[PDB]
Amino acid sequence: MIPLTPLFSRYKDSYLLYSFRLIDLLRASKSTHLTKLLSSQATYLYHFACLMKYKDIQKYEVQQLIEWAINASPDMDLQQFRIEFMDKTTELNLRSCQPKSFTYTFTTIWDTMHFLSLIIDDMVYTRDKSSLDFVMQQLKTMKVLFYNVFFILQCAMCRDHYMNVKGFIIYHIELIEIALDKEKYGTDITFVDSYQQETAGADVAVVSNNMLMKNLMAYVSMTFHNHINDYKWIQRNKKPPAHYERMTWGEYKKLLNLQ
Amino acid sequence: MIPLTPLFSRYKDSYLLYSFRLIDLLRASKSTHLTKLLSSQATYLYHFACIQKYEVQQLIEWAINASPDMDLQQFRIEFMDKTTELNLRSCQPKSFTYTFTTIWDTMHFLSLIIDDMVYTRDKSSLDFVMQQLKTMKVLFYNVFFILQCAMCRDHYMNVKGFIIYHIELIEIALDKEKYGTDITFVDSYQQETAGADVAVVSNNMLMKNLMAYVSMTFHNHINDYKWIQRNKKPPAHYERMTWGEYKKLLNLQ
């Protein structure tokens, strides 16, 4: 599974904060259509939180927690939902889905996207080559999760930039789907250490090749992270300042102790 | 300039056909929203084929008021004449067989336009090239299908950002040049991704013919995935387009 490091536990806590803030909104859903959309996302978010923790999605326990948050008092004040959330969560033995910190920043959102990426890379590396059925389904859920990233926070240019470029991320998830599918039909995945080797092996005329960068999604999501911060200087019409430092792959791997 | 080749000629005609079929839906629009968007797309589309900006402005205002009641072969006839009335024979498609290939050809044609504009940029008119890049993203964000394939549109709307991301790379590259560092053009995608793996803004590497490579790769991806979409293994005669081959077909250097 995934290396335990300080950053990864910030990711894990940020991710539960993001989930908690998305079920909070359930209360306020004036829209039938918005309620169902949030129900599915909250379902899926806690599915992947329980999966890594209990080794089981707990479909009927999280199903309870959703009913609750939709049928919750839609006239709370911040903590007026938090309090009973802890009260609800523990009656379902889901306390390990309670966030420790509640300060919701842009890094809550980044941490959550990086978190899901590490889950995809882990699910793929620890795949049993029989229930490819399982992993391939989760990848589909992951695309659905990255497609509907709620900001909760209000930043309209962030929201419109992402809708324009998020397909960069979803594209690489689908690369993995092609890789798992090629393995189901007898061509094992050849894991490679560089994104550039995966680029080189994609440029073939036949379908018989199957290379995939190890920790693809950690690399994709970080490159994407750099890209958003690269581009914000254009939206702001400034030269990138000297204080601006970009994440390099080798340093990112070091911080999360990836091999 | 873009090399004149058989494939490139087919691209330009497919592009006119796509633009023709786009304005054919102006007369059918029952929405102020959709008329504005269709007209934006059209203005951009013909702008990138041409300036005759007033002859086009009224080719479109003609397309808005054309008879809703016509069949397609009639609108064509009326369009084939308003174009000649307008000194715009160059916008007339030669074929009208509209297929998935017409859409792909249109996406590849816009890609060659991006690469050409960037490579023949002028270090003083970067403000112009960067405003063109913003128009392109709108064209790519808004790919109408005309023909109906709901999974095609659902899929495109999920991964179209792969293409738009790479347009935004070029913008980033041009901004590092407005501020002092000239673009270096590299011959492989690998080098460009290696040059972006730096902590400090010292590099400005761009793949030459990047958007052609990007649009080719993305085209292969769509076809790669259609076999998964059909619980199937791809036929033995399926052949992915390779980069060396694609440059050979368009005489790219």
Ligand SMILES: Cc1cc2nc3c(=O)[nH]c(=O)nc-3n(C[C@H](O)[C@H](O)[C@H](O)COP(=O)(O)OP(=O)(O)OC[C@H]3O[C@@H](n4cnc5c(N)ncnc54)[C@H](O)[C@@H]3O)c2cc1C
């Ligand atoms: C989907 C999304 C879209 C956004 N779109 C825009 C936009 O369009 N315009 C705009 O101005 N802002 C946008 N933002 C916010 C922007 O990215 C930054 O969050 C903010 O502008 C600056 O915050 P910061 O200086 O703390 O850097 P941050 O990137 O927020 O730092 C947060 C954490 O991430 C670490 N980190 C930095 N880079 C990486 C990396 N490549 N990979 C992994 N970790 C990294 C940092 O060291 C730190 O731990 C977006 C954010 C998200 C999540």
Ligand SMILES: Cc1cc2nc3c(=O)[nH]c(=O)nc-3n(C[C@H](O)[C@H](O)[C@H](O)COP(=O)(O)OP(=O)(O)OC[C@H]3O[C@@H](n4cnc5c(N)ncnc54)[C@H](O)[C@@H]3O)c2cc1C
């Ligand atoms: C945006 C878009 C999205 C689509 N999404 C789907 C989908 O989700 N599911 C589905 O089943 N179909 C989808 N299609 C249609 C699909 O891509 C094929 O076009 C279709 O299946 C017809 O098969 P074909 O072999 O005749 O087309 P193609 O093989 O794609 O024919 C296009 C022409 O251009 C050439 N060409 C082929 N590949 C490339 C390449 N990688 N780069 C440059 N040139 C190339 C070929 O020589 C051919 O002449 C999509 C099409 C478009 C334009």
